[PDB]
């Protein structure tokens, strides 16, 4: 399957090389290969997967927004017809974005999530699942936009339920999940009060648990807590 003939460990090794070379498409292809070997991923391996795809879809999203914005301007009063080109190219980028999202969601469904028993692995994958439906939701306008939104909410919510049960409030994955879910509420679900409440509660419970941490953990937790604070500053 492109990568079916390369060793798992070589795929991982090359994923790290690709990251150092800022070759995120290669990185993604390599970790896709790795995943398709059928073995569970270690913590570090989960991060490599996540980072690879986040960079790919991130480039796609930034491009989409640029084009979507040109498109919206062109469809204004006094704007001159330029032809179908802007919409065509926006659609091409969009199609390629969706393909990537479906690919990640595919890997999560076949079979990362059902094999993830530990809180840290399961929450990590459900977070990803919520993220990749959220990215689909950003560009969605059709019969199943709401279903797409609900798919995100549902993956996020299950992640949260487990995270609240199994992880301390300062757990970086719990924190990043809550950050992202609160962005979902604000940007996707039209629920800015939910967004603000989640971010606030998350920040305060974490604050109260920092005393239990080592210096290295403290640095990990406070970094994400600062992202929660930045959002709150913007939103309030």
């Amino acid at each position: 399957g492109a990568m079916g003939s390369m060793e798992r460990a070589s795929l991982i090794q090359k994923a790290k090389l690709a990251e150092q070379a800022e070759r995120y498409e290669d990185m993604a292809a390599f970790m896709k290969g790795a995943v398709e070997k059928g073995e569970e991923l270690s913590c570090e391996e989960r991060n490599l997967l996540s980072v690879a795809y986040k960079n790919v879809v991130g480039g796609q999203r930034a491009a989409w927004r640029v084009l979507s914005s040109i498109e919206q301007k062109s469809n204004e009063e006094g704007s001159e017809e330029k032809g179908p080109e802007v919409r065509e190219y926006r659609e091409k980028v969009e199609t390629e974005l969706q393909g990537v999202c479906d690919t990640v969601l595919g890997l999560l469904d076949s079979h990362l999530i059902k094999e993830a028993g530990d809180a840290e692995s399961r929450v990590f994958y459900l977070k990803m699942k919520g993220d990749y439906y959220r990215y689909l939701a950003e560009v969605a306008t059709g019969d199943d936009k709401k279903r797409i939104i609900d798919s995100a909410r549902s993956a996020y919510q299950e992640a949260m339920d487990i995270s609240k049960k199994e992880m301390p409030p300062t757990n970086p994955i719990r924190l990043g999940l809550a950050l992202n879910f609160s962005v979902f509420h604000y940007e996707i679900a039209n629920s800015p009060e939910e967004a603000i409440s989640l971010a606030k509660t998350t920040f305060d419970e974490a604050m109260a648990d920092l005393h239990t941490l080592s210096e290295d953990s403290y640095k990990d937790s406070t970094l994400i807590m600062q992202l929660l604070r930045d959002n709150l500053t913007l939103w309030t």
Binding site: E19, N47, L48, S50, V51, K54, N55, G58, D131, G176, L179, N180, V183, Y186, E187, I224, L227, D230, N231, L234, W235
Partner: peptide
Amino acid sequence: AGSIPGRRS
């Protein structure tokens, strides 16, 4: 509104 940058591993 910032999500996890998650860009460097």
